[PDB]
Amino acid sequence: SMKIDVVTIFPEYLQPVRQSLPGKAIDAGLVDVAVHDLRRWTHDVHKSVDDSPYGGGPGMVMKPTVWGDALDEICTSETLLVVPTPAGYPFTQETAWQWSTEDHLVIACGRYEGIDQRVADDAATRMRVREVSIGDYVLNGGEAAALVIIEAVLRLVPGVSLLEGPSYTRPPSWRGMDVPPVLLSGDHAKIAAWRAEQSRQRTIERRPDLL
Amino acid sequence: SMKIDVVTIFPEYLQPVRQSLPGKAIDAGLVDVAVHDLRRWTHDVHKSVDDSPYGGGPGMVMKPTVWGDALDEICTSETLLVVPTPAGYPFTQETAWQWSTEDHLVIACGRYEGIDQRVADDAATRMRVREVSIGDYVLNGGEAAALVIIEAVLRLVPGVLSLLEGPSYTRPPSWRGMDVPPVLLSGDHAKIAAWRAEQSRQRTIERRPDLLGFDS
Ligand SMILES: OB(O)c1ccc2[nH]ccc2c1
Numbered sequence: 001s002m003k004i005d006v007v008t009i010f011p012e013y014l015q016p017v018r019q020s021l022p023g024k025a026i027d028a029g030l031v032d033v034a035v036h037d038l039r040r041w042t043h044d045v046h047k048s049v050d051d052s053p054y055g056g057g058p059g060m061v062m063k064p065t066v067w068g069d070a071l072d073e074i075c076t077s078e079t080l081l082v083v084p085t086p087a088g089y090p091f092t093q094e095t096a097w098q099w100s101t102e103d104h105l106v107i108a109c110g111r112y113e114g115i116d117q118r119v120a121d122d123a124a125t126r127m128r129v130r131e132v133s134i135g136d137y138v139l140n141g142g143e144a145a146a147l148v149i150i151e152a153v154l155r156l157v158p159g160v161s162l163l164e165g166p167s168y169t170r171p172p173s174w175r176g177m178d179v180p181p182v183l184l185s186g187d188h189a190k191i192a193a194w195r196a197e198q199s200r201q202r203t204i205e206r207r208p209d210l211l
Numbered sequence: 212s213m214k215i216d217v218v219t220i221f222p223e224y225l226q227p228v229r230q231s232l233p234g235k236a237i238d239a240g241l242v243d244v245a246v247h248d249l250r251r252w253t254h255d256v257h258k259s260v261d262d263s264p265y266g267g268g269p270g271m272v273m274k275p276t277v278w279g280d281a282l283d284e285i286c287t288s289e290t291l292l293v294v295p296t297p298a299g300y301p302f303t304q305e306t307a308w309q310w311s312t313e314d315h316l317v318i319a320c321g322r323y324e325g326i327d328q329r330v331a332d333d334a335a336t337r338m339r340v341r342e343v344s345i346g347d348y349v350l351n352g353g354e355a356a357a358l359v360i361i362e363a364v365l366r367l368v369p370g371v372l373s374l375l376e377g378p379s380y381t382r383p384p385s386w387r388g389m390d391v392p393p394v395l396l397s398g399d400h401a402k403i404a405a406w407r408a409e410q411s412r413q414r415t416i417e418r419r420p421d422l423l424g425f426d427s
Pocket of ligand 1: 295296297320321322323324325343344345346348349350351352353356
């Protein structure tokens with residue numbers, strides 16, 4: 001089984017992924033995803049979660065005292081703490097496979113300007129911490145990245161190179177375009193070879209880095 | 212103003228667009244986001260959107276007929292049609308800047324093993340089409356990728372407001388016995404700039420050496 005806890009100031013952002021888990025998976029206790037409003041751990045009447053950056057500059061930095069309290073409550077020694085950030089290590093399919101066998105993921109969603117670095121650094125002294133980027137672009141906050149990570153990981157939990165080439169289905173002719181006849185040939189070795197060439201061409205065109 | 216139409220068999224998944232930055236941009240009238248149920252364009256009682264692949268293989272492929280009808284209605288020749296796919300060109304910060312200037316994005320979200328290739332090929336005879344991958348991982352469908360693309364693009368549109376950013380800090384100056392780097396408290400703009408530039412380049416070599424032209 002896997003437990004995922006997500007901490008965010010926008011808990012409703014995660015609601016359409018809880019309502020996305022099959023009832024059978026939950027009933028079988030294979031998965032539980034819980035979302036927590038970071039403001040539960042604020043200290044002041046204004047429910048402050050960020051503050052101006054030391055050393056100056058634009059934006060705000062999320063408060064270590066608030067995050068520290070939240071993670072103290074939610075995390076245990078077994079936790080893998082995931083922090084989405086454009087400054088992270090790359091999150092890849094390999095990462096997804098690795099995390100798919102974890103018992104407890106906690107995903108700390110913050111603004112891209114960051115969570116005070118002492119939060120992750122403190123957490124790393126008693127649990128595993130992974131700061132990760134889902135791509136080479138900036139998002140305002142970590143919530144959409146959390147959705148991507150949750151989906152990529154959970155689809156690898158049972159019951160919860162080259163690029164793929166083009167796919168086709170009925171009808172065989174549509175708006176003047178025919179399905180490649182080789183796919184209708186019943187020559188399955190030839191079909192495999194054709195698909196391999198399609199994959200090669202597409203990878204050269206779109207992702208030459210992979211070669 | 213920008214218009215973004217999203218087409219999906221799971222319109223409820225696109226509800227998060229009402230949150231955070233996209234929500235604020237919508238309320239500020241800088242963008243209109245409309246989500247459409249692809250099944251609106253089916254005609255059978257079963258509302259089928261998929262069929263087995265020609266040539267074999269696991270799973271199902273989304274039918275071109277339903278998609279063609281949907282895109283016929285929603286798209287114009289000025290539309291930028293965005294198709295998330297793990298087999299797409301990379302979506303990068305440069306892409307986000309480029310698309311931030313667009314009048315009309317339509318994001319076609321696939322499921323199963325993807326969409327019959329003729330949908331994109333047909334659309335390309337009438338409009339610009341972009342098949343894009345948001346990263347090197349596989350999702351179950353295009354919906355989460357649509358959210359990522361919308362978030363990355365909208366924060367760049369006029370009026371909504373390389374290397375890795377290094378660590379950031381805020382009050383208190385000491386916490387759990389961990390001190391904010393003294394230079395950040397020193398008020399010396401030059402020394403702070405230099406420390407930050409250095410932290411940025413150091414984090415980059417460790418986490419993203421590719422950005423500086425190194426292996427891995
Ligand atoms: O970018 B994703 O990995 C992605 C995008 C679109 C998709 N359609 C079906 C799976 C699927 C996966």
